[PDB]
């Protein structure tokens with residue numbers, strides 16, 4: 163079923179809450195035993211959001227290999243993503259270790275450091291060129307190189323140095339700064355513009371490690387970004403683009419990380435972004 167017809171039918175019937183609960187009911191349930199070990203309690207932002215054991219990213223250290231991050235491998239689309247929580251004061255060094263070890267080119271951040279008057283993640287990158295950050299626990303240095311501030315997003319170039327070997331890499335930080343404190347954006351136009359800026363950078367391409375994507379918990383906004391990207395890629399690739407089923411792509415993604423897409427509005431909005439994306443590409 164052409165998803166815009168499916169969309170109009172769910173909208174006119176006001177059944178978004180019913181479709182969303184059906185997804186919640188069919189979603190995979192896998193063990194998360196490492197996440198729940200007592201030694202890991204201060205590495206988790208939220209008690210009810212944990213990576214599955216089978217898909218968790220392992221840090222390359224014998225001490226404690228745990229970070230709250232998941233590899234989402236989309237086989238038919240040929241895209242991988244790492245979805246993670248916003249870093250905590252005591253996990254900023256682990257975050258940048260993971261970026262280094264997984265060979266990522268890009269970091270995609272979909273939240274503000276403060277929202278609704280509370281801290282949603284640590285200030286994990288330098289705000290001035292001349293004040294670099296040193297992470298003594300993982301032996302890394304991070305420097306701001308340049309900053310490009312636009313109306314809906316900011317792009318930063320960062321230099322990450324492994325102080326152990328003195329190798330350096332350029333990381334691109336893509337920061338979506340305008341997602342509202344409550345609900346979802348009214349139009350998907352600025353979110354699609356942002357997605358195409360990430361794609362244009364090389365950050366999502368197979369010559370690099372997987373892109374790192376986060377919001378506060380790493381499931382809601384983060385889930386929207388990777389679901390919209392994967393659905394548009396499948397429409398480009400397949401002979402029958404009308405066969406792309408957004409609900410089936412979401413269930414496949416939920417085999418790798420729990421709770422992706424947190425509300426019926428986020429589902430409805432994910433449908434909105436994919437529909438608007440399919441016509442910009444038909445070049446109406």
Ligand SMILES: CCNc1ccc(C(=O)O)cc1
Pocket residue numbers: 164165397398403404440443444
């Ligand atoms: C036949 C109705 N459904 C679709 C039409 C065109 C495309 C596309 O060319 O991206 C995707 C779906």
